């Protein structure tokens, strides 16, 4: 049986990613959020609700990426150095998920936090999109998987990492770029710094497997990716209408969604699908 | 679909272990090992070979614990906070494995390192024990597992963490407790500080599942654990004879093996199997 040997390269890139992943290492203890109370308490009812909801949503998605997505993809790779990077990424998903609880503990009462988690567990849209993504991961729960299965699990992973979070991320970034909830904003920026590299790394791996597919499998996977994209888009349009209509930001978030979906596509070596618009400069500022 | 909520306990212990795991965080870059060259050159060739070999052995076992053991156990837990801790542990298995390469890069030439990993990959006793352990993990590569299967994968995990490493750990500790290879020794001590807690944590989880088994499944799992224990032992005794006969330390290491096997059992809430015997104070000093 092979042990990992980092003195002999298995590829051109895993070492650089391992180094960057660990250079970016953080834990929630390192950001105090209590100074955010002062801006929190001046937001409207509707603004507090939107924030809590989107954070609740992100928590779920990181829960799944750490508990299913990373582990199941890594177990089937034969590249042991690439494997190592994914296992580190997986741990960091759990830091991410935990960091949202760190934000809640300072902003919300014990009863308000039970409220948010009851809403997230009962949410039909969060269930659907998490369900769609997680369906590709769960196919990997068997001894030998095909390369088409592995590839599609990786496509779902990058969709999740580079695309699905950003209807959520939008709002902590909008608030931070106005000087509100900046301590929480720093956390979301640390999360996002991780996800950016997650997405790129899994996308490189996906492209290696794509190259190992027959021409006809290549065409199938292309079709399926495009369908998956539009399926998810529909659900993100519903999500975003639900969350943001109360605070008049629907179209701003939608632009951001499309922008991020194109980044997801690009990480997978695919062409952009949405025409590029101006992202709201106040979110850019929060970035 | 549930998101992890750390403001509401899922158990009595996961939070404390999550905190201790992340408080013990380290990477190889924090320990310079070049100062070890001076003592290295003064060891006999038999001593160097024994060190390189055991390190090679440890690298393999960590490779498998990070790439199969932690991921496969964590996917089938329903306790999301417990799941978090395992994912962090999994990442740390990768740090550990990488750390042995950091040591080799200082102490051995590129051609000498290719040598050790050739020996590792071809080793019939490393293949057997890693094979045995890993057979319980691979059982989890299906959509639904039984509690008996999960429990046994956890037993194997503890046996790996609390028992199978220590025929290897012995020798870096022996050398360090004499002032030799002390920088490498600090690395092993960091590794061992992690593995102590790994073993205790996985053992708590196993005991929970044991309580959920019928009386008859409890009896089966007991018979199988005892057999697995003895199967491994006969392999470790062959291993220790191979490695350590050249430097006269066979029986010392064997006493340490049995000692650590009793710790493994204890972590699982089972009774000790081996009579207690004086462990070498020099290794205790390296601890
Ligand atoms: Fe994440
Ligand atoms: Fe991620
Ligand atoms: Fe380890
Ligand atoms: Fe471990």
Short mmCIF file of N, CA, C and O in Angstrom, two decimals, chain A residues 101-206:
data_model
loop_
_atom_site.label_atom_id
_atom_site.label_comp_id
_atom_site.label_asym_id
_atom_site.label_seq_id
_atom_site.Cartn_x
_atom_site.Cartn_y
_atom_site.Cartn_z
N UNK A 101 -22.22 30.07 13.88
CA UNK A 101 -22.65 29.97 15.29
C UNK A 101 -21.94 31.01 16.20
O UNK A 101 -22.56 31.62 17.05
N UNK A 102 -20.66 31.23 15.98
CA UNK A 102 -19.95 32.28 16.69
C UNK A 102 -20.64 33.65 16.47
O UNK A 102 -20.91 34.33 17.42
N UNK A 103 -21.00 33.98 15.22
CA UNK A 103 -21.80 35.19 14.95
C UNK A 103 -23.17 35.24 15.62
O UNK A 103 -23.52 36.21 16.31
N UNK A 104 -23.95 34.18 15.49
CA UNK A 104 -25.23 34.08 16.22
C UNK A 104 -25.12 34.23 17.74
O UNK A 104 -25.95 34.91 18.37
N UNK A 105 -24.12 33.59 18.34
CA UNK A 105 -24.01 33.59 19.79
C UNK A 105 -23.91 35.04 20.28
O UNK A 105 -24.51 35.38 21.31
N UNK A 106 -23.27 35.92 19.49
CA UNK A 106 -23.10 37.30 19.94
C UNK A 106 -24.28 38.21 19.52
O UNK A 106 -24.55 39.22 20.17
N UNK A 107 -25.01 37.87 18.46
CA UNK A 107 -26.03 38.76 17.94
C UNK A 107 -27.39 38.41 18.48
O UNK A 107 -28.19 39.30 18.69
N UNK A 108 -27.65 37.13 18.74
CA UNK A 108 -28.99 36.62 18.93
C UNK A 108 -29.13 35.89 20.26
O UNK A 108 -28.16 35.32 20.72
N UNK A 109 -30.37 35.86 20.81
CA UNK A 109 -30.70 35.10 22.03
C UNK A 109 -30.80 33.62 21.75
O UNK A 109 -30.96 33.22 20.59
N UNK A 110 -30.75 32.79 22.78
CA UNK A 110 -30.77 31.31 22.58
C UNK A 110 -32.04 30.88 21.83
O UNK A 110 -32.00 30.03 20.92
N UNK A 111 -33.15 31.52 22.19
CA UNK A 111 -34.44 31.31 21.57
C UNK A 111 -34.46 31.82 20.10
O UNK A 111 -35.00 31.14 19.24
N UNK A 112 -33.89 32.98 19.79
CA UNK A 112 -33.75 33.45 18.39
C UNK A 112 -32.91 32.48 17.57
O UNK A 112 -33.13 32.36 16.37
N UNK A 113 -31.88 31.83 18.17
CA UNK A 113 -31.04 30.90 17.38
C UNK A 113 -31.77 29.58 17.11
O UNK A 113 -31.72 29.09 15.99
N UNK A 114 -32.45 29.01 18.11
CA UNK A 114 -33.37 27.87 17.87
C UNK A 114 -34.35 28.18 16.71
O UNK A 114 -34.54 27.34 15.82
N UNK A 115 -34.97 29.37 16.75
CA UNK A 115 -35.81 29.88 15.66
C UNK A 115 -35.14 29.75 14.26
O UNK A 115 -35.68 29.09 13.38
N UNK A 116 -33.95 30.31 14.09
CA UNK A 116 -33.29 30.24 12.79
C UNK A 116 -33.08 28.80 12.34
O UNK A 116 -33.22 28.52 11.17
N UNK A 117 -32.69 27.90 13.25
CA UNK A 117 -32.33 26.53 12.84
C UNK A 117 -33.54 25.67 12.53
O UNK A 117 -33.48 24.82 11.63
N UNK A 118 -34.65 25.92 13.23
CA UNK A 118 -35.97 25.39 12.88
C UNK A 118 -36.40 25.84 11.46
O UNK A 118 -36.84 25.04 10.65
N UNK A 119 -36.26 27.12 11.16
CA UNK A 119 -36.48 27.59 9.80
C UNK A 119 -35.55 26.91 8.77
O UNK A 119 -36.02 26.47 7.70
N UNK A 120 -34.24 26.86 9.04
CA UNK A 120 -33.34 26.21 8.03
C UNK A 120 -33.68 24.73 7.82
O UNK A 120 -33.82 24.31 6.67
N UNK A 121 -33.88 23.94 8.88
CA UNK A 121 -34.19 22.51 8.73
C UNK A 121 -35.56 22.33 8.00
O UNK A 121 -35.78 21.34 7.34
N UNK A 122 -36.48 23.28 8.12
CA UNK A 122 -37.80 23.07 7.54
C UNK A 122 -37.92 23.74 6.16
O UNK A 122 -38.99 23.70 5.54
N UNK A 123 -36.85 24.35 5.67
CA UNK A 123 -36.96 25.17 4.47
C UNK A 123 -37.01 24.33 3.19
O UNK A 123 -36.06 23.60 2.87
N UNK A 124 -38.10 24.45 2.43
CA UNK A 124 -38.17 23.66 1.20
C UNK A 124 -37.11 23.99 0.16
O UNK A 124 -36.61 23.05 -0.43
N UNK A 125 -36.76 25.26 -0.07
CA UNK A 125 -35.76 25.61 -1.06
C UNK A 125 -34.37 25.17 -0.67
O UNK A 125 -33.56 24.89 -1.56
N UNK A 126 -34.04 25.24 0.62
CA UNK A 126 -32.67 24.93 1.05
C UNK A 126 -32.55 23.42 0.91
O UNK A 126 -31.49 22.91 0.55
N UNK A 127 -33.66 22.73 1.19
CA UNK A 127 -33.69 21.29 1.10
C UNK A 127 -33.46 20.88 -0.36
O UNK A 127 -32.65 20.00 -0.64
N UNK A 128 -34.17 21.52 -1.28
CA UNK A 128 -34.03 21.18 -2.68
C UNK A 128 -32.61 21.39 -3.15
O UNK A 128 -32.02 20.47 -3.72
N UNK A 129 -32.03 22.58 -2.95
CA UNK A 129 -30.73 22.78 -3.59
C UNK A 129 -29.67 21.94 -2.92
O UNK A 129 -28.81 21.38 -3.60
N UNK A 130 -29.71 21.86 -1.60
CA UNK A 130 -28.76 21.00 -0.90
C UNK A 130 -28.98 19.55 -1.36
O UNK A 130 -28.03 18.85 -1.62
N UNK A 131 -30.24 19.14 -1.49
CA UNK A 131 -30.62 17.84 -2.01
C UNK A 131 -30.05 17.56 -3.41
O UNK A 131 -29.49 16.50 -3.65
N UNK A 132 -30.14 18.53 -4.30
CA UNK A 132 -29.60 18.35 -5.63
C UNK A 132 -28.09 18.12 -5.54
O UNK A 132 -27.56 17.20 -6.17
N UNK A 133 -27.39 18.96 -4.77
CA UNK A 133 -25.95 18.88 -4.77
C UNK A 133 -25.51 17.58 -4.15
O UNK A 133 -24.72 16.82 -4.71
N UNK A 134 -26.07 17.32 -3.00
CA UNK A 134 -25.77 16.16 -2.20
C UNK A 134 -26.12 14.81 -2.90
O UNK A 134 -25.48 13.75 -2.59
N UNK A 135 -27.02 14.84 -3.89
CA UNK A 135 -27.35 13.64 -4.67
C UNK A 135 -26.14 13.16 -5.47
O UNK A 135 -25.94 11.96 -5.68
N UNK A 136 -25.29 14.08 -5.90
CA UNK A 136 -24.10 13.67 -6.64
C UNK A 136 -23.05 13.10 -5.76
O UNK A 136 -22.34 12.19 -6.14
N UNK A 137 -23.00 13.59 -4.53
CA UNK A 137 -22.05 13.08 -3.56
C UNK A 137 -22.42 11.66 -3.12
O UNK A 137 -21.57 10.79 -2.99
N UNK A 138 -23.68 11.45 -2.87
CA UNK A 138 -24.14 10.20 -2.34
C UNK A 138 -24.00 9.02 -3.30
O UNK A 138 -23.82 7.91 -2.85
N UNK A 139 -23.98 9.28 -4.60
CA UNK A 139 -23.57 8.27 -5.60
C UNK A 139 -22.17 7.67 -5.36
O UNK A 139 -21.81 6.67 -5.99
N UNK A 140 -21.34 8.35 -4.59
CA UNK A 140 -19.97 7.92 -4.38
C UNK A 140 -19.86 6.95 -3.21
O UNK A 140 -18.79 6.45 -2.91
N UNK A 141 -20.98 6.69 -2.55
CA UNK A 141 -21.02 5.74 -1.43
C UNK A 141 -21.09 4.33 -1.97
O UNK A 141 -22.07 3.64 -1.81
N UNK A 142 -20.03 3.93 -2.66
CA UNK A 142 -19.87 2.55 -3.05
C UNK A 142 -18.38 2.36 -3.35
O UNK A 142 -17.64 3.34 -3.42
N UNK A 143 -17.94 1.09 -3.46
CA UNK A 143 -16.51 0.78 -3.52
C UNK A 143 -15.78 1.32 -4.70
O UNK A 143 -14.68 1.80 -4.52
N UNK A 144 -16.36 1.23 -5.88
CA UNK A 144 -15.72 1.71 -7.11
C UNK A 144 -16.71 2.64 -7.78
O UNK A 144 -17.86 2.30 -7.94
N UNK A 145 -16.27 3.84 -8.15
CA UNK A 145 -17.12 4.79 -8.89
C UNK A 145 -16.56 5.00 -10.28
O UNK A 145 -15.36 4.81 -10.50
N UNK A 146 -17.41 5.40 -11.22
CA UNK A 146 -16.95 5.71 -12.58
C UNK A 146 -16.41 7.12 -12.59
O UNK A 146 -16.72 7.93 -11.70
N UNK A 147 -15.64 7.42 -13.63
CA UNK A 147 -15.06 8.73 -13.77
C UNK A 147 -16.16 9.80 -14.07
O UNK A 147 -16.01 10.96 -13.68
N UNK A 148 -17.26 9.41 -14.71
CA UNK A 148 -18.35 10.33 -14.99
C UNK A 148 -19.03 10.76 -13.67
O UNK A 148 -19.32 11.94 -13.47
N UNK A 149 -19.17 9.80 -12.76
CA UNK A 149 -19.73 10.02 -11.43
C UNK A 149 -18.86 10.90 -10.57
O UNK A 149 -19.35 11.83 -9.89
N UNK A 150 -17.57 10.60 -10.57
CA UNK A 150 -16.62 11.40 -9.85
C UNK A 150 -16.59 12.83 -10.40
O UNK A 150 -16.68 13.79 -9.64
N UNK A 151 -16.46 12.96 -11.72
CA UNK A 151 -16.50 14.27 -12.37
C UNK A 151 -17.73 15.11 -11.98
O UNK A 151 -17.62 16.30 -11.69
N UNK A 152 -18.91 14.50 -11.99
CA UNK A 152 -20.13 15.24 -11.71
C UNK A 152 -20.24 15.61 -10.25
O UNK A 152 -20.86 16.66 -9.92
N UNK A 153 -19.67 14.80 -9.37
CA UNK A 153 -19.63 15.15 -7.99
C UNK A 153 -18.74 16.40 -7.84
O UNK A 153 -19.07 17.31 -7.04
N UNK A 154 -17.63 16.46 -8.57
CA UNK A 154 -16.75 17.60 -8.53
C UNK A 154 -17.37 18.86 -9.15
O UNK A 154 -17.07 19.94 -8.69
N UNK A 155 -18.14 18.72 -10.22
CA UNK A 155 -18.92 19.81 -10.79
C UNK A 155 -19.90 20.36 -9.73
O UNK A 155 -19.99 21.57 -9.54
N UNK A 156 -20.59 19.48 -9.02
CA UNK A 156 -21.55 19.90 -7.98
C UNK A 156 -20.82 20.60 -6.88
O UNK A 156 -21.34 21.61 -6.33
N UNK A 157 -19.58 20.13 -6.61
CA UNK A 157 -18.81 20.70 -5.51
C UNK A 157 -18.44 22.13 -5.91
O UNK A 157 -18.53 23.07 -5.07
N UNK A 158 -18.03 22.34 -7.17
CA UNK A 158 -17.60 23.69 -7.50
C UNK A 158 -18.81 24.58 -7.61
O UNK A 158 -18.75 25.78 -7.30
N UNK A 159 -19.93 24.01 -8.04
CA UNK A 159 -21.15 24.80 -8.10
C UNK A 159 -21.44 25.28 -6.71
O UNK A 159 -21.72 26.47 -6.54
N UNK A 160 -21.34 24.40 -5.74
CA UNK A 160 -21.66 24.75 -4.36
C UNK A 160 -20.69 25.85 -3.90
O UNK A 160 -21.14 26.93 -3.55
N UNK A 161 -19.39 25.57 -4.02
CA UNK A 161 -18.32 26.44 -3.52
C UNK A 161 -18.30 27.79 -4.24
O UNK A 161 -18.12 28.81 -3.60
N UNK A 162 -18.39 27.80 -5.57
CA UNK A 162 -18.15 29.01 -6.33
C UNK A 162 -19.47 29.72 -6.74
O UNK A 162 -19.43 30.84 -7.29
N UNK A 163 -20.62 29.12 -6.45
CA UNK A 163 -21.88 29.63 -7.03
C UNK A 163 -23.01 29.72 -5.99
O UNK A 163 -23.48 30.83 -5.70
N UNK A 164 -23.44 28.61 -5.42
CA UNK A 164 -24.52 28.61 -4.45
C UNK A 164 -24.40 29.46 -3.16
O UNK A 164 -25.41 29.89 -2.59
N UNK A 165 -23.20 29.70 -2.68
CA UNK A 165 -23.03 30.50 -1.45
C UNK A 165 -23.35 31.96 -1.66
O UNK A 165 -23.72 32.62 -0.71
N UNK A 166 -23.17 32.47 -2.89
CA UNK A 166 -23.03 33.88 -3.08
C UNK A 166 -24.40 34.68 -2.97
O UNK A 166 -24.39 35.86 -2.69
N UNK A 167 -25.55 34.00 -3.09
CA UNK A 167 -26.84 34.65 -2.81
C UNK A 167 -26.90 34.94 -1.32
O UNK A 167 -27.64 35.84 -0.88
N UNK A 168 -26.09 34.21 -0.55
CA UNK A 168 -25.98 34.38 0.87
C UNK A 168 -24.91 35.35 1.26
O UNK A 168 -25.16 36.35 1.97
N UNK A 169 -23.70 35.10 0.80
CA UNK A 169 -22.63 36.04 1.03
C UNK A 169 -22.99 37.48 0.70
O UNK A 169 -22.38 38.40 1.21
N UNK A 170 -23.88 37.70 -0.24
CA UNK A 170 -24.13 39.07 -0.73
C UNK A 170 -24.43 40.09 0.38
O UNK A 170 -23.98 41.26 0.31
N UNK A 171 -25.15 39.64 1.40
CA UNK A 171 -25.73 40.55 2.30
C UNK A 171 -24.74 40.95 3.40
O UNK A 171 -24.59 42.11 3.66
N UNK A 172 -23.99 39.99 3.98
CA UNK A 172 -22.93 40.41 4.89
C UNK A 172 -21.92 41.36 4.21
O UNK A 172 -21.41 42.27 4.85
N UNK A 173 -21.71 41.20 2.91
CA UNK A 173 -20.82 42.06 2.16
C UNK A 173 -21.43 43.46 1.87
O UNK A 173 -20.73 44.45 1.92
N UNK A 174 -22.72 43.50 1.53
CA UNK A 174 -23.47 44.75 1.40
C UNK A 174 -23.45 45.56 2.67
O UNK A 174 -23.17 46.72 2.62
N UNK A 175 -23.78 44.93 3.81
CA UNK A 175 -23.69 45.62 5.12
C UNK A 175 -22.27 46.10 5.46
O UNK A 175 -22.09 47.24 5.86
N UNK A 176 -21.26 45.25 5.26
CA UNK A 176 -19.88 45.61 5.60
C UNK A 176 -19.35 46.74 4.77
O UNK A 176 -18.64 47.57 5.28
N UNK A 177 -19.71 46.80 3.50
CA UNK A 177 -19.27 47.86 2.65
C UNK A 177 -19.97 49.20 2.95
O UNK A 177 -19.69 50.16 2.29
N UNK A 178 -20.89 49.19 3.90
CA UNK A 178 -21.45 50.39 4.52
C UNK A 178 -20.98 50.60 5.98
O UNK A 178 -21.55 51.43 6.69
N UNK A 179 -19.99 49.83 6.43
CA UNK A 179 -19.47 49.98 7.79
C UNK A 179 -20.31 49.32 8.84
O UNK A 179 -20.12 49.57 10.05
N UNK A 180 -21.25 48.47 8.42
CA UNK A 180 -22.08 47.76 9.36
C UNK A 180 -21.70 46.30 9.44
O UNK A 180 -21.46 45.66 8.40
N UNK A 181 -21.73 45.78 10.66
CA UNK A 181 -21.44 44.39 10.94
C UNK A 181 -20.10 44.02 10.32
O UNK A 181 -19.98 42.96 9.71
N UNK A 182 -19.10 44.87 10.53
CA UNK A 182 -17.81 44.67 9.92
C UNK A 182 -17.01 43.50 10.52
O UNK A 182 -16.17 42.90 9.84
N UNK A 183 -17.23 43.20 11.80
CA UNK A 183 -16.48 42.16 12.44
C UNK A 183 -16.96 40.82 11.87
O UNK A 183 -16.16 40.02 11.46
N UNK A 184 -18.28 40.66 11.74
CA UNK A 184 -18.88 39.56 11.05
C UNK A 184 -18.50 39.49 9.60
O UNK A 184 -18.30 38.39 9.04
N UNK A 185 -18.43 40.66 8.98
CA UNK A 185 -17.93 40.83 7.61
C UNK A 185 -16.52 40.26 7.39
O UNK A 185 -16.23 39.70 6.31
N UNK A 186 -15.65 40.41 8.38
CA UNK A 186 -14.27 39.87 8.31
C UNK A 186 -14.29 38.36 8.27
O UNK A 186 -13.56 37.75 7.52
N UNK A 187 -15.15 37.76 9.08
CA UNK A 187 -15.37 36.35 9.06
C UNK A 187 -15.84 35.87 7.66
O UNK A 187 -15.21 35.00 7.06
N UNK A 188 -16.90 36.45 7.12
CA UNK A 188 -17.36 36.09 5.81
C UNK A 188 -16.28 36.27 4.76
O UNK A 188 -16.20 35.43 3.83
N UNK A 189 -15.41 37.30 4.90
CA UNK A 189 -14.28 37.45 3.98
C UNK A 189 -13.25 36.33 4.14
O UNK A 189 -12.68 35.91 3.16
N UNK A 190 -13.07 35.82 5.36
CA UNK A 190 -12.12 34.70 5.57
C UNK A 190 -12.69 33.43 5.00
O UNK A 190 -11.99 32.67 4.32
N UNK A 191 -13.98 33.25 5.20
CA UNK A 191 -14.66 32.14 4.59
C UNK A 191 -14.49 32.18 3.08
O UNK A 191 -14.11 31.13 2.44
N UNK A 192 -14.76 33.34 2.48
CA UNK A 192 -14.74 33.56 1.01
C UNK A 192 -13.35 33.38 0.47
O UNK A 192 -13.17 32.80 -0.59
N UNK A 193 -12.34 33.92 1.17
CA UNK A 193 -10.95 33.62 0.77
C UNK A 193 -10.68 32.11 0.68
O UNK A 193 -10.01 31.66 -0.24
N UNK A 194 -11.17 31.32 1.65
CA UNK A 194 -11.06 29.88 1.53
C UNK A 194 -11.82 29.33 0.31
O UNK A 194 -11.24 28.60 -0.53
N UNK A 195 -13.08 29.70 0.18
CA UNK A 195 -13.91 29.12 -0.89
C UNK A 195 -13.35 29.37 -2.26
O UNK A 195 -13.47 28.52 -3.12
N UNK A 196 -12.77 30.55 -2.44
CA UNK A 196 -12.19 30.94 -3.73
C UNK A 196 -11.13 29.89 -4.18
O UNK A 196 -11.08 29.45 -5.36
N UNK A 197 -10.32 29.45 -3.22
CA UNK A 197 -9.26 28.48 -3.53
C UNK A 197 -9.79 27.06 -3.56
O UNK A 197 -9.28 26.27 -4.31
N UNK A 198 -10.81 26.76 -2.77
CA UNK A 198 -11.52 25.50 -2.83
C UNK A 198 -12.02 25.21 -4.23
O UNK A 198 -11.73 24.13 -4.82
N UNK A 199 -12.75 26.18 -4.75
CA UNK A 199 -13.36 26.17 -6.08
C UNK A 199 -12.35 25.98 -7.20
O UNK A 199 -12.58 25.24 -8.19
N UNK A 200 -11.25 26.67 -7.08
CA UNK A 200 -10.20 26.58 -8.08
C UNK A 200 -9.62 25.16 -8.00
O UNK A 200 -9.56 24.52 -9.03
N UNK A 201 -9.28 24.67 -6.79
CA UNK A 201 -8.64 23.37 -6.66
C UNK A 201 -9.53 22.24 -7.17
O UNK A 201 -9.08 21.39 -7.95
N UNK A 202 -10.81 22.23 -6.81
CA UNK A 202 -11.69 21.16 -7.23
C UNK A 202 -11.94 21.24 -8.74
O UNK A 202 -12.13 20.23 -9.43
N UNK A 203 -11.90 22.44 -9.28
CA UNK A 203 -12.07 22.65 -10.66
C UNK A 203 -10.86 22.10 -11.40
O UNK A 203 -11.03 21.55 -12.46
N UNK A 204 -9.65 22.26 -10.88
CA UNK A 204 -8.50 21.66 -11.56
C UNK A 204 -8.64 20.15 -11.61
O UNK A 204 -8.40 19.51 -12.65
N UNK A 205 -9.04 19.57 -10.49
CA UNK A 205 -9.21 18.11 -10.43
C UNK A 205 -10.29 17.65 -11.44
O UNK A 205 -10.12 16.63 -12.14
N UNK A 206 -11.39 18.42 -11.52
CA UNK A 206 -12.49 18.05 -12.45
C UNK A 206 -11.99 18.01 -13.86
O UNK A 206 -12.31 17.08 -14.58
#
